[PDB]
């Protein structure tokens, strides 16, 4: 019933380079609200903590996007995926693989769009990512 | 499977927009461009051009949305004329526009993000072409709200074709030729973008 406060507590959705970073200037006013992490076509995307899958749909730009509720209105988002490995309603425990990376928003290079929202509001995720 | 471009002739009927010192009226420019743009888009098999306003009447912000939605528009282009106090202020401009409850929001908040991006890229493209036929009063895309009301789903740009306040540009904006050139530009602008990022 909550991600709790950032403390390298949570699993890395996927491991690799941080291609784009929370806050990174995109263009004009627009600046990233997630991280783009590098990974191979079809690398297994793991759920950062314990929670329930509340969404798995295909969003223009962000490819197929899974979203996991952890409580409070703390949730994790995972986009650019080719395919999900769970269905809305499913319960997922941290570590559990929930998607497979693609370029499905990446466009240019296999990657994961990973975002955390706390009070449904997008924050820098990094401080949660521990081991 | 065609890309659907809503062309929104700014102002209309009751509201003339800005009127030049020579008495030419924003509304009668915007529509005259918008039709030339529809022609250039429907000419291109990649695109279908459709109008939010298709004659001289008033139509609310909302209504221009509801038309573009009811025409399943994939992207929207509003056409306007700028006008300043400073009568020698001239030049084209381009504007980029906007709009479990914690998921409810999150999805809109992503789509906002995409829209805003496509918008900006298209704006860039467009200015690109506009600066070939005129000068720009702003060479970067200016972010703003107002129109689009609440389309986080459909990206939109506003093209200030020039300053109808400026006795010179007024005459160009009343020029079939130059309206054509503006249409051509705004078109090439989209073409260049969607060419490179087709609807996949
Ligand atoms: Zn106007």
Numbering used by the authors:
A (entry chain B): 297 to 427
B (entry chain A): 190 to 288, 322 to 422
Text taken from the publication that reported this structure:
Peptidoglycan amidases are key hydrolytic enzymes that are needed to break the peptidoglycan layer during cell division to allow for separation of daughter cells. All the three division-associated amidases have overlapping enzymatic functions in hydrolyzing the peptidoglycan amide bond between the sugar and the first amino acid of the peptide cross-link. In their resting states, zinc-dependent peptidoglycan amidases such as AmiB and AmiC adopt autoinhibited conformations in which their active sites are blocked by an alpha helix containing a conserved glutamate residue which binds to the active-site zinc. The activators share a common motif, the LytM domain, which forms the proposed site of amidase binding and activation.
After extensive crystallization trials, we were ultimately successful in solving a crystal structure of the AmiB hydrolytic domain bound to the EnvC LytM domain using proteins from Citrobacter rodentium. First, the EnvC LytM domain is bound directly to the amidase interaction helix, with the latter’s hydrophobic residues all pointing directly into the LytM groove. Second, the amidase regulatory domain has a very different conformation in the EnvC-bound structure such that the interaction helix is contiguous with helix 5 and the blocking helix is displaced from the active site. Finally, the active-site zinc is ligated by three residues rather than the five due to the absence of the blocking helix glutamate (Glu167 in AmiA) and dissociation of one of the aspartates (Asp271 in AmiB, equivalent to Asp135 in AmiA). The structure of the EnvC–LytM AmiB complex shows that the amidase interaction helix binds within the same groove as the restraining arm, lending further support for this mechanism. Additionally, the activator–amidase structure further identifies a distinctive loop (C. rodentium EnvC residues G319–G330) that contacts residues located between the interaction helix and helix 5. The extended loop wraps around the residues located between the interaction helix and helix 5, causing them to form a single, continuous, helical element. In the EnvC LytM AmiB costructure, the angles between neighboring ligating residues and the zinc are all close to 109°, suggesting a tetrahedral coordination state in which the fourth position remains open for substrate binding and catalysis. Inspecting the density surrounding the zinc, a low-occupancy ligand is present at the fourth position of the coordination sphere.
